mmCIF file of C-alpha atoms and ligand atoms in Angstrom:
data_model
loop_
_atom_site.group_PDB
_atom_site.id
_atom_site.type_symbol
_atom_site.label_atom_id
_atom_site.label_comp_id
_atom_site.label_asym_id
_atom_site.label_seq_id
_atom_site.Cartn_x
_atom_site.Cartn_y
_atom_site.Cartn_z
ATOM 1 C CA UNK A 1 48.568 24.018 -46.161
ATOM 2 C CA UNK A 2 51.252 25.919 -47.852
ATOM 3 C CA UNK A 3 50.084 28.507 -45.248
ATOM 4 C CA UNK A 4 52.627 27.561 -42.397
ATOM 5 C CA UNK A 5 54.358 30.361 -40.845
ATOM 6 C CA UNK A 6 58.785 29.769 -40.619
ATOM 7 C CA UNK A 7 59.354 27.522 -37.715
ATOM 8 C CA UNK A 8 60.287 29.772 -34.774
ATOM 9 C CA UNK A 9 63.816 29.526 -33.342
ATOM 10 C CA UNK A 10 63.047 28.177 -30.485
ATOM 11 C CA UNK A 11 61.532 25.022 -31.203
ATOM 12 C CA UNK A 12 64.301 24.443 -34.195
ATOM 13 C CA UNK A 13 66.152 22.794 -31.481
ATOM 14 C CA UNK A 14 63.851 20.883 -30.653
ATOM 15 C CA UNK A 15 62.649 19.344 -33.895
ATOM 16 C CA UNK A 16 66.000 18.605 -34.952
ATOM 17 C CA UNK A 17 65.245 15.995 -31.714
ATOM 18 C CA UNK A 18 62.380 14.447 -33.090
ATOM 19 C CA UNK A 19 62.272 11.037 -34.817
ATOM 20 C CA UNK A 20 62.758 11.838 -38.335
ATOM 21 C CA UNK A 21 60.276 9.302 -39.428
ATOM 22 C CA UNK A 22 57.469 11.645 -37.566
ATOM 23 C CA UNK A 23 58.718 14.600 -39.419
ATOM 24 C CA UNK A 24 58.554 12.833 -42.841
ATOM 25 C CA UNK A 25 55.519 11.492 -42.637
ATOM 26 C CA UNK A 26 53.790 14.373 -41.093
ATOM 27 C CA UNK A 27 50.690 15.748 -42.542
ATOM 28 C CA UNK A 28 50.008 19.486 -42.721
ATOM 29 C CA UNK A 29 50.872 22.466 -41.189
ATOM 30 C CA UNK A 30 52.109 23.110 -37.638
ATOM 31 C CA UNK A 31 49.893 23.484 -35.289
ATOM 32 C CA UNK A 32 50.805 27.163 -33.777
ATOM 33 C CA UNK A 33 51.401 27.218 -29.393
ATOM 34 C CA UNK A 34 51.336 30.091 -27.147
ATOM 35 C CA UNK A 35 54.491 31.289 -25.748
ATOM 36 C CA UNK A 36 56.507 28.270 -24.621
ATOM 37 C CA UNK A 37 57.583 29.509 -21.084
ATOM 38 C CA UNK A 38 53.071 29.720 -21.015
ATOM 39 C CA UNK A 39 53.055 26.188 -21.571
ATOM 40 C CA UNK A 40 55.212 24.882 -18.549
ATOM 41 C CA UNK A 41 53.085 22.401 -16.841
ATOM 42 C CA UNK A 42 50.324 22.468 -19.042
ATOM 43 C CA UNK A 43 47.521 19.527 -20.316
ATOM 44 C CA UNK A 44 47.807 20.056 -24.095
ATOM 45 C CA UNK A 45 45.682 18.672 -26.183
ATOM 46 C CA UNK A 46 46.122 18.597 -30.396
ATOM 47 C CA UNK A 47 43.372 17.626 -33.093
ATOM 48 C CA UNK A 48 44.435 16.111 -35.396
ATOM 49 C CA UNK A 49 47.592 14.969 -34.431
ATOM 50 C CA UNK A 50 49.066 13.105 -37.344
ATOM 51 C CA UNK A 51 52.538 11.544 -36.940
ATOM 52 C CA UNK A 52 53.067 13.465 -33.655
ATOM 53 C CA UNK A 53 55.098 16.050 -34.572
ATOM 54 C CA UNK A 54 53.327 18.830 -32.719
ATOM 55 C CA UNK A 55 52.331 16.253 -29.900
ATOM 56 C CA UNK A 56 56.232 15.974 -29.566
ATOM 57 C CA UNK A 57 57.494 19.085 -29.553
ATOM 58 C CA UNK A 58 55.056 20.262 -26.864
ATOM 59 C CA UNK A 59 55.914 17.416 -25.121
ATOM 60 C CA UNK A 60 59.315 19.097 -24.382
ATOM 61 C CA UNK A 61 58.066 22.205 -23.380
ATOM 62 C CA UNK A 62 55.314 21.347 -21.081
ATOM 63 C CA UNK A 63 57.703 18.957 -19.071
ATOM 64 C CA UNK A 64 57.480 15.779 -16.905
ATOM 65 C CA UNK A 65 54.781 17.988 -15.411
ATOM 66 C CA UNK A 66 52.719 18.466 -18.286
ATOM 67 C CA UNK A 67 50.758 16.409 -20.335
ATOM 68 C CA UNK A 68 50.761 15.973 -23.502
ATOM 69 C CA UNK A 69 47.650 14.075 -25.887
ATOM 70 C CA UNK A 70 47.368 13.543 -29.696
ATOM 71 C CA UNK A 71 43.484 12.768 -31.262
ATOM 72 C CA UNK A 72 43.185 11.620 -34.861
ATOM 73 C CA UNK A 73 41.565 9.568 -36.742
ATOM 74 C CA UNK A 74 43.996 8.386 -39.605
ATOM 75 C CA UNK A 75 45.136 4.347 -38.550
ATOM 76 C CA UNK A 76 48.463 5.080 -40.898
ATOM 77 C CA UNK A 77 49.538 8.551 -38.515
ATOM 78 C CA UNK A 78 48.844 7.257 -35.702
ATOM 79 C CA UNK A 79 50.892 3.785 -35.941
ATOM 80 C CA UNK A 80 53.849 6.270 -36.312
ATOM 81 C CA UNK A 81 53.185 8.281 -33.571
ATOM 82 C CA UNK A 82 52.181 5.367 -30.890
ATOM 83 C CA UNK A 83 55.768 3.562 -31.918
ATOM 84 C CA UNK A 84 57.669 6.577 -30.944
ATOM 85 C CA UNK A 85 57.180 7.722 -27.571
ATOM 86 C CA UNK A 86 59.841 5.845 -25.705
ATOM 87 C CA UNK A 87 61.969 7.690 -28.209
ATOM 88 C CA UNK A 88 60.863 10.667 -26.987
ATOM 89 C CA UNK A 89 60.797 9.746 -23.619
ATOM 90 C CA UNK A 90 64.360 9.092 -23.494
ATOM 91 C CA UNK A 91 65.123 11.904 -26.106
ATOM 92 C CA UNK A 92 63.625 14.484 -23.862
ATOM 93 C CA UNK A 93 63.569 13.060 -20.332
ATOM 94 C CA UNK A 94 66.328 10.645 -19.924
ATOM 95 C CA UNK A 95 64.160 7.245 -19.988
ATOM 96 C CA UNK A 96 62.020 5.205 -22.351
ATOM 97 C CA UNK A 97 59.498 4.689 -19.105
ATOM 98 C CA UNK A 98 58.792 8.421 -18.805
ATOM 99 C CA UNK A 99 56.702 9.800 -21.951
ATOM 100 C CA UNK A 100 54.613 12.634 -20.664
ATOM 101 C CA UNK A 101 52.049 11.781 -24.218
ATOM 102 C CA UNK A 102 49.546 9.679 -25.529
ATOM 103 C CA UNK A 103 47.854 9.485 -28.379
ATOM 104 C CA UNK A 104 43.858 8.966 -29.273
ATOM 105 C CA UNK A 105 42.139 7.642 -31.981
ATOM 106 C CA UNK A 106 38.511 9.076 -32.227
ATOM 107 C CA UNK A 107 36.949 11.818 -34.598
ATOM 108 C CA UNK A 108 37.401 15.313 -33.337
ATOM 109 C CA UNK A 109 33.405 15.832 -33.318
ATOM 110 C CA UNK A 110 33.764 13.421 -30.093
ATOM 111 C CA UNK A 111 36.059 13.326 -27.828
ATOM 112 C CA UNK A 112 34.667 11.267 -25.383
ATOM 113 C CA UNK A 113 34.365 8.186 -27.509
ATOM 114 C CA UNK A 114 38.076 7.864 -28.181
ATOM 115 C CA UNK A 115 40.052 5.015 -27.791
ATOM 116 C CA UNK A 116 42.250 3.386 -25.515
ATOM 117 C CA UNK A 117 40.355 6.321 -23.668
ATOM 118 C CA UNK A 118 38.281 9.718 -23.705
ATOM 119 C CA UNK A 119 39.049 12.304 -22.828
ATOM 120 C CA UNK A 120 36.988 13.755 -19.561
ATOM 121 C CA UNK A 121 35.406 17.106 -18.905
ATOM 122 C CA UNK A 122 37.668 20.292 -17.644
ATOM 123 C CA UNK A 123 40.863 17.755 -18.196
ATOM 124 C CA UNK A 124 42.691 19.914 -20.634
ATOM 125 C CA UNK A 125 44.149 23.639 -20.463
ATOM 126 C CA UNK A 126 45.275 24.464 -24.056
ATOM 127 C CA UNK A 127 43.438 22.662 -27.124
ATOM 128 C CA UNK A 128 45.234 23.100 -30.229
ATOM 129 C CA UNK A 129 44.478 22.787 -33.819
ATOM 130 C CA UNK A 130 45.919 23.717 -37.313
ATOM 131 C CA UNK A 131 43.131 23.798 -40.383
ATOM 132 C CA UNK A 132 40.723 20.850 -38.895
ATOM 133 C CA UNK A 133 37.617 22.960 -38.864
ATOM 134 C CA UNK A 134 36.389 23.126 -42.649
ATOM 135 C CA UNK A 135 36.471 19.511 -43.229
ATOM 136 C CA UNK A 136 34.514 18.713 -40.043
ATOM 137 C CA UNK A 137 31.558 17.149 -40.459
ATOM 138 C CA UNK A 138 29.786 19.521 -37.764
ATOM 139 C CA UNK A 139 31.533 22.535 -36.415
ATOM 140 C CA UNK A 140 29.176 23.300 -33.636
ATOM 141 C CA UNK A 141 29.711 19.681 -31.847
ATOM 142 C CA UNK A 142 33.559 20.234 -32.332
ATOM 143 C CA UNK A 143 33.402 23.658 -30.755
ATOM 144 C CA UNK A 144 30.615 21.864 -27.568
ATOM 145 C CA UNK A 145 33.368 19.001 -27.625
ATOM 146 C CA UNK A 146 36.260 21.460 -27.152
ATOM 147 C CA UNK A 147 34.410 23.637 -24.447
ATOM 148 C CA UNK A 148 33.777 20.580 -22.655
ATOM 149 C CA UNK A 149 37.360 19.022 -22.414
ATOM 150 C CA UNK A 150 38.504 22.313 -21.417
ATOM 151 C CA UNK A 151 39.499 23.732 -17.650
ATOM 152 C CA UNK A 152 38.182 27.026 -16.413
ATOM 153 C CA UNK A 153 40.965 29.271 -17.237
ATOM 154 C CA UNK A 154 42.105 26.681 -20.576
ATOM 155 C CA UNK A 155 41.858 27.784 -24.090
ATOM 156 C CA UNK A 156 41.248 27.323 -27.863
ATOM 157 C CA UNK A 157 44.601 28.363 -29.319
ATOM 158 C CA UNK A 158 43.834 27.788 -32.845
ATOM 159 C CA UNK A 159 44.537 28.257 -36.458
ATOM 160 C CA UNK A 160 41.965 28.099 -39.265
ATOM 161 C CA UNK A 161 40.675 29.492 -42.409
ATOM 162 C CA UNK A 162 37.880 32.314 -42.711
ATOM 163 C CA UNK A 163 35.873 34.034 -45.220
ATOM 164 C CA UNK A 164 34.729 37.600 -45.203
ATOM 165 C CA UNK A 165 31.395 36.892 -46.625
ATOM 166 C CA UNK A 166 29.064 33.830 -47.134
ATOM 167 C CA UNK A 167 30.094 31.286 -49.667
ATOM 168 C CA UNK A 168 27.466 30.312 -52.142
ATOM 169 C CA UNK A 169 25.639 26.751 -51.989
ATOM 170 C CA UNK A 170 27.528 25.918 -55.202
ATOM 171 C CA UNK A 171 30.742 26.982 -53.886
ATOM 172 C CA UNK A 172 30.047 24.487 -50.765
ATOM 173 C CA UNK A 173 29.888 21.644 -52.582
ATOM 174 C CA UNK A 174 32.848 21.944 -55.088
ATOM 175 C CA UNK A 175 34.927 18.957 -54.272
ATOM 176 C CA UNK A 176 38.581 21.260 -54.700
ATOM 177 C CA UNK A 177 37.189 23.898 -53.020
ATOM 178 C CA UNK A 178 36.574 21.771 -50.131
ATOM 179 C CA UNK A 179 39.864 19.792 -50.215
ATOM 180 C CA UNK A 180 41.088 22.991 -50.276
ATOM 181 C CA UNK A 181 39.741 23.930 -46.822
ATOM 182 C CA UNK A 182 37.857 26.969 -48.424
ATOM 183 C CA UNK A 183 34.550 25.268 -49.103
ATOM 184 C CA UNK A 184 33.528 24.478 -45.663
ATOM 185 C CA UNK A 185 34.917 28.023 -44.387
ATOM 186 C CA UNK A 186 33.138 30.207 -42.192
ATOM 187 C CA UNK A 187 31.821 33.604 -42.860
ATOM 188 C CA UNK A 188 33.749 35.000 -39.774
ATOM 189 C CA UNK A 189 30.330 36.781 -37.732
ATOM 190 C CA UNK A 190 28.815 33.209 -38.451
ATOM 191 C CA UNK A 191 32.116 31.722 -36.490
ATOM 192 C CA UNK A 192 31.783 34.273 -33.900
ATOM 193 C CA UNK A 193 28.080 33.306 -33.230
ATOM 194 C CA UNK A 194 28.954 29.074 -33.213
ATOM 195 C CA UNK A 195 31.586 29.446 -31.049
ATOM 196 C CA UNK A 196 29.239 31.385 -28.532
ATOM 197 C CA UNK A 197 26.450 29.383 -28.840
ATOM 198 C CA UNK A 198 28.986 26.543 -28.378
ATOM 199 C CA UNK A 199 30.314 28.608 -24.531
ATOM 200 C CA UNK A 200 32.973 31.328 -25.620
ATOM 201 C CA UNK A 201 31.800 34.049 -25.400
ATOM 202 C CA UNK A 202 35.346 35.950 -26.172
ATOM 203 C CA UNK A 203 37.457 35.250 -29.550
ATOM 204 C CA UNK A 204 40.660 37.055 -29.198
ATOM 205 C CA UNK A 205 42.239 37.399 -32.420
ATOM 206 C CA UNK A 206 45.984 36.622 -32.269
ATOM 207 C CA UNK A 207 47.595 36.886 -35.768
ATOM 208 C CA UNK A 208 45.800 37.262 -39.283
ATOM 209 C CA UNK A 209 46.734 36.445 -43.090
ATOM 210 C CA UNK A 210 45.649 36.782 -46.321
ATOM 211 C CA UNK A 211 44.737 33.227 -48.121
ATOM 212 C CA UNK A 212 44.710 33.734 -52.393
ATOM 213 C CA UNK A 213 42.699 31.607 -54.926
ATOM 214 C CA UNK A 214 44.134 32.443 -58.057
ATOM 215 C CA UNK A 215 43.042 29.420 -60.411
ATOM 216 C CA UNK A 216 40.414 31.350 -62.089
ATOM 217 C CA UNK A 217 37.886 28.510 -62.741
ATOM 218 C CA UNK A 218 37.924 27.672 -59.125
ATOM 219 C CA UNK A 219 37.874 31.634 -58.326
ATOM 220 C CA UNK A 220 34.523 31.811 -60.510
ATOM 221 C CA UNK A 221 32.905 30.122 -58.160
ATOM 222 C CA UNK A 222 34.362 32.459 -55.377
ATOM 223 C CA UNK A 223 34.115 35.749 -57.338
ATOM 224 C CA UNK A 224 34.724 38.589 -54.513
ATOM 225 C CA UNK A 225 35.375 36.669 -51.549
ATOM 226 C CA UNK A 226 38.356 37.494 -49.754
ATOM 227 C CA UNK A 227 39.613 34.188 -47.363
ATOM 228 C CA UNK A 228 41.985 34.444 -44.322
ATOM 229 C CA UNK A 229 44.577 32.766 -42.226
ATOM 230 C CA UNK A 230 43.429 33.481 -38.569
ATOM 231 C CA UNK A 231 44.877 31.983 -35.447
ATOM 232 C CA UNK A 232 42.621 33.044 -32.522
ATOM 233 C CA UNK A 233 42.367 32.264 -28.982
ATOM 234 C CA UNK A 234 39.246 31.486 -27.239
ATOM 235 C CA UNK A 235 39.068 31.286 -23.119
ATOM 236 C CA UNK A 236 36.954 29.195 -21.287
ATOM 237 C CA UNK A 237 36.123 31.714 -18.330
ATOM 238 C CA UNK A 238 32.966 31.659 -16.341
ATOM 239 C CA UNK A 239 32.642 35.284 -15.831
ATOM 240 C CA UNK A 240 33.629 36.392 -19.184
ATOM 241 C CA UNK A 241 30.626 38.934 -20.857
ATOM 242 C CA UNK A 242 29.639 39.489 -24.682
ATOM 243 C CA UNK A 243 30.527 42.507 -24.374
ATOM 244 C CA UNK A 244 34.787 44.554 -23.294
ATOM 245 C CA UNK A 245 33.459 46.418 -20.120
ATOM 246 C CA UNK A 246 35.690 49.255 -18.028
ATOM 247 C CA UNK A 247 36.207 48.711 -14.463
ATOM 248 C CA UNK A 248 39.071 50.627 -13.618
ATOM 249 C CA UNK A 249 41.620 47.961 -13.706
ATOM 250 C CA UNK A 250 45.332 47.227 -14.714
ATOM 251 C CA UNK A 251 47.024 44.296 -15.104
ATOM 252 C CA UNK A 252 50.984 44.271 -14.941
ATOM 253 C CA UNK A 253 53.202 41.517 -16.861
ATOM 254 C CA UNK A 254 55.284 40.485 -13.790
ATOM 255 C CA UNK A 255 57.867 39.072 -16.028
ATOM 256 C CA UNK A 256 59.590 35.106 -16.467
ATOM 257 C CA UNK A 257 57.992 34.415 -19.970
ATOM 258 C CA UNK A 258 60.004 36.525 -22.062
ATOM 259 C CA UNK A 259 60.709 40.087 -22.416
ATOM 260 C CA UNK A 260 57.031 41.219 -22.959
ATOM 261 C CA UNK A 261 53.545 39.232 -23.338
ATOM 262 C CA UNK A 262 51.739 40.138 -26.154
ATOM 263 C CA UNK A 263 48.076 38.355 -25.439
ATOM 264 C CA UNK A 264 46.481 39.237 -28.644
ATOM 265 C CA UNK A 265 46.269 42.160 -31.158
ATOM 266 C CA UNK A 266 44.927 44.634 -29.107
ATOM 267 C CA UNK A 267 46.498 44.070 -25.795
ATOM 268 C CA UNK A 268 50.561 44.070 -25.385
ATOM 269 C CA UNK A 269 51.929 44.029 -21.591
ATOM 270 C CA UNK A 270 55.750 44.875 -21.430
ATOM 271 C CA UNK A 271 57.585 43.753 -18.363
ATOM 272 C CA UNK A 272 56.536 45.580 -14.793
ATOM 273 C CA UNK A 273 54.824 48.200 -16.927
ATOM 274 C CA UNK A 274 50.814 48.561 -15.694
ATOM 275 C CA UNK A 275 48.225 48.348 -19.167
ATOM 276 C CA UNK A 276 44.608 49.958 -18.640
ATOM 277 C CA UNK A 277 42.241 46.159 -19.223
ATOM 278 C CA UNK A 278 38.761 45.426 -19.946
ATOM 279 C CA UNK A 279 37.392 43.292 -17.533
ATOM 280 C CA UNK A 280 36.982 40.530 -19.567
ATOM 281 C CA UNK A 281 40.890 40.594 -19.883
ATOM 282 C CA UNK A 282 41.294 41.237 -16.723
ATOM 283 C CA UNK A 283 39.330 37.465 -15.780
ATOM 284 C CA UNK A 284 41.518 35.676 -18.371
ATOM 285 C CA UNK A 285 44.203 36.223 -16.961
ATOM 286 C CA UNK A 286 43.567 36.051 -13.711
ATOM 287 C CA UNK A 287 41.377 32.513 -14.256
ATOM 288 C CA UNK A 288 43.977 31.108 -16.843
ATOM 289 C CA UNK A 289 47.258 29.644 -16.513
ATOM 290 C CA UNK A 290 48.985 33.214 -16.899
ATOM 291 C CA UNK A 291 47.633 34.505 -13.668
ATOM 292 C CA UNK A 292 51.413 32.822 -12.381
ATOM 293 C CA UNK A 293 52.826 35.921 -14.179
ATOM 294 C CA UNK A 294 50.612 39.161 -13.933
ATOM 295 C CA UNK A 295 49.243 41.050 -11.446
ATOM 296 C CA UNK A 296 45.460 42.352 -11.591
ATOM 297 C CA UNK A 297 44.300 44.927 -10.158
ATOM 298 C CA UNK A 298 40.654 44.700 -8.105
ATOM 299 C CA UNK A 299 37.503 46.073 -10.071
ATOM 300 C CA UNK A 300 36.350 49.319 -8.854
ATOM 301 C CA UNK A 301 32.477 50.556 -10.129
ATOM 302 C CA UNK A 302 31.716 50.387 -13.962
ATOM 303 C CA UNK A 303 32.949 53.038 -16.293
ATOM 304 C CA UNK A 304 31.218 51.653 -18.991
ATOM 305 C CA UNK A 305 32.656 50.371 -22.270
ATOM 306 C CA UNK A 306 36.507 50.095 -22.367
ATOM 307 C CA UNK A 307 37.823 52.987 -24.174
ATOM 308 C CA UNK A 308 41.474 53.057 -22.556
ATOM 309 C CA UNK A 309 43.245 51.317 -25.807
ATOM 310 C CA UNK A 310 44.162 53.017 -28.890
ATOM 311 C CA UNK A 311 42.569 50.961 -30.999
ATOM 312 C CA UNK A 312 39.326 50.436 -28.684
ATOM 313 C CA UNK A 313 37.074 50.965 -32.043
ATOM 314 C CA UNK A 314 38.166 48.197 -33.586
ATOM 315 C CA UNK A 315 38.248 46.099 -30.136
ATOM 316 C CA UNK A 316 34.307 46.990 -29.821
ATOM 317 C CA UNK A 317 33.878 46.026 -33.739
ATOM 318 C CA UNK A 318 32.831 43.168 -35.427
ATOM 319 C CA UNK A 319 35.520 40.342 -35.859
ATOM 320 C CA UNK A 320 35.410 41.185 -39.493
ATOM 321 C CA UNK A 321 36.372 44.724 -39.423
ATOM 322 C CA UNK A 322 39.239 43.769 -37.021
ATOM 323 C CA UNK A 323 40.742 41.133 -39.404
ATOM 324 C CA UNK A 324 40.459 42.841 -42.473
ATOM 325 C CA UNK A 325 41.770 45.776 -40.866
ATOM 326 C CA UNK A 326 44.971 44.250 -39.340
ATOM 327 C CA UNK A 327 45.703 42.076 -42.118
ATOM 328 C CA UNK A 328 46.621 45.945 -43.630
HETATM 329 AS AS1 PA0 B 1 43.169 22.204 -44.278
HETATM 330 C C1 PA0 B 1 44.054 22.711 -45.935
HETATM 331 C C2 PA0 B 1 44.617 23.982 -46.087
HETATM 332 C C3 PA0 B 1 45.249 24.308 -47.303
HETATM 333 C C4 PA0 B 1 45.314 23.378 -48.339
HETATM 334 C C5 PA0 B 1 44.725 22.099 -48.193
HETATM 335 C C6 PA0 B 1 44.081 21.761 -46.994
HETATM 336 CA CA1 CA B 2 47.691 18.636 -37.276
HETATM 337 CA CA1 CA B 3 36.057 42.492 -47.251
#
């Protein structure tokens, strides 16, 4: 894209360590992580991987006891990625022999079949992904595939581009459109109801921008449609509900991941400072990986829906109104 966001300062550093061969050949944009200190430990797996260069980086900030895995499909990428993880090995660990990565070659749609090897069911706890969606050639196996590689408690931390309305059948088969990424984009209530019929049942929207198409022969064929940037989170949690339901708790950032934990747009937890939660919050954390750093309070008796937010409207609303609204 020429949609990447700057490089945050914290993983300058480290991709000033990476081979520059990976960085030059890299295709795309970044694919965007959760906090680092969140991803100590973690299985993390990126599709579309490329040259490695997001592979890499996470590499050094899950550690020797995370896991890193690269998927793609591109022969040329991949070569350069597979020759460089002794580099990285040493670069970041001390020693050729100990690589915490590996990298795939299979379409996204399919996981499983990969080669040397697929990747199993509830292996992985973050799945991430920068602008692969709109070229797939079926978004509701890709979004099955993804729910089925992840853990209870893993997510979909993912970056993509969304429409506010439904393209037209002529716009969906313009051949720039589509190289684009906009001709294959989602209406974003049409995402919301794939990704639930594919298991997640909770899309937590995490940072939004505004996409242009300003070549107006291109635009003609796109008159009023406005497109987004949206990098969302979706947990797989058992217990999670369609619906942001009030019982009683709080959930307290305990600290250790930096000074405050912002989760998503709606719900910010400063450090040893208790924030009213829906109980659908309340289960991702406590189910995910950032249960090591909160404490959650037990559910009393329903309240009803979860008002105690000061933007609870737009929490209840559809994922529409809350991206157009907090892209302004
Ligand atoms: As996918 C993607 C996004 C922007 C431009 C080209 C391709
Ligand atoms: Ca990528
Ligand atoms: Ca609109």
């Amino acid at each position: 894209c020429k949609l990447a966001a700057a490089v945050p300062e914290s993983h300058r550093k480290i991709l000033a360590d990476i081979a520059d061969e990976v960085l030059e050949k890299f295709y795309g944009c970044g694919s965007t992580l959760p906090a680092d200190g969140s991803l100590e430990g973690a299985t993390v797996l990126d599709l579309g991987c490329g040259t490695g260069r997001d592979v890499y980086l996470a590499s050094k900030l899950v550690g020797e006891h995370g896991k890193v895995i690269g998927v793609d499909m591109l022969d040329n990428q991949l070569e350069v990625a597979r020759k460089y993880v002794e580099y990285h090995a040493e670069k970041f660990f001390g020693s050729p022999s100990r690589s915490n990565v590996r990298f795939l070659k299979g379409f996204i749609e399919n996981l499983a079949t990969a080669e040397p090897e697929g990747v199993p069911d509830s292996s992985v706890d973050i799945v991430i992904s920068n602008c692969v969606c709109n070229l797939s050639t079926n978004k509701l196996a890709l979004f099955k595939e993804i729910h089925r590689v992840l853990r209870d408690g893993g997510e979909l931390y993912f970056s993509d581009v969304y429409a506010d309305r439904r393209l037209s059948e002529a716009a969906q088969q313009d051949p720039i459109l589509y190289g684009e990424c906009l001709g294959g984009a989602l209406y974003l209530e049409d995402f919301r109801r794939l990704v639930a019929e594919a298991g997640f049942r909770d899309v937590r929207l995490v940072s939004v921008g505004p996409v242009d198409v300003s070549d107006p022969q291109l635009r003609k064929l796109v008159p009023d449609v406005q497109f987004y940037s949206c990098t969302f989170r979706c947990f797989k949690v058992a217990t999670l509900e369609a619906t942001r339901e009030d019982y009683g708790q709080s959930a307290t950032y305990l600290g250790g991941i930096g000074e405050e934990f912002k989760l998503d747009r709606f719900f910010t937890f400063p450090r040893e400072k208790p924030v009213r939660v829906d109980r659908n919050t309340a289960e991702i954390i406590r189910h995910s990986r950032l249960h090591q750093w909160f404490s959650v309070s037990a559910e009393q008796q329903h309240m009803g829906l979860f008002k105690a937010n000061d933007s609870y409207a737009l929490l209840h609303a559809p994922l529409s109104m809350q991206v157009e609204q907090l892209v302004s």
